[PDB]
Design an enzyme around this catalytic site. Structure first.
Site, short mmCIF file in Angstrom:
data_model
loop_
_atom_site.label_atom_id
_atom_site.label_comp_id
_atom_site.label_asym_id
_atom_site.label_seq_id
_atom_site.Cartn_x
_atom_site.Cartn_y
_atom_site.Cartn_z
CB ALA A 7 -13.77 33.82 64.82
CB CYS A 8 -15.81 29.19 61.75
SG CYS A 8 -16.19 29.74 60.07
N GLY A 9 -12.63 28.55 61.53
CA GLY A 9 -11.49 28.30 60.66
C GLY A 9 -11.29 26.82 60.39
#
Length: 92
Positions: A7-9
């Site tokens: 999960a990257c943001g």
């Protein structure tokens, strides 16, 4: 079987470099590992079934596993570094 989410943001919609990278390494090693891609608000329920998790930020929750910052996967060169740490358990 090891289910590792991602999960990257930051800027990119989804973790492309990371996945494309890891998946490339896992193959060379020939290990029984499967990469998973989900949203930041998807890791919640995917905490039990999953085994390992990696995120760049927003890591403030009751995680039940050794989270690994995705700082190394900023460009796509310092992968082997973190990979060695996560792999320590994968093929312990």
């Amino acid at each position: 079987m090891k289910q590792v989410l991602v999960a990257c943001g930051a800027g990119i919609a989804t973790s492309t470099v990371v996945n494309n990278a890891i998946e490339e390494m896992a193959k060379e090693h020939n290990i029984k590992v499967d990469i998973k891609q989900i949203k930041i608000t998807e890791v919640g329920p995917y905490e039990d079934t999953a085994d390992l998790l990696v995120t760049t930020a927003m890591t403030k929750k009751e995680y039940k596993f050794p989270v690994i910052n995705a700082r190394n996967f900023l460009t796509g060169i310092g992968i082997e570094e973190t990979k060695q740490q996560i792999l320590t358990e994968l093929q312990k």
